[PDB]
Amino acid sequence: SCPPCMEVSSCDEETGECEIGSRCPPC
């Protein structure tokens, strides 16, 4: 069974801010 999708937080160095992005575990 495929693991349910989740939102992860990633911080970019571009302007120093972080974004929450949905990342779905692959099958």
Contact 10, 19 (CB under 8 A): yes
Contact 2, 19 (CB under 8 A): no
> Which residue type occupies 5?
C
| Domain boundaries defined on the chain | 1-27
Running DSSP on this structure, what letter comes out for residue 16? Answer: S
Tokens linked to 6: 């989740």
Cα(13)–Cα(23) distance, rounded to whole angstroms? 20
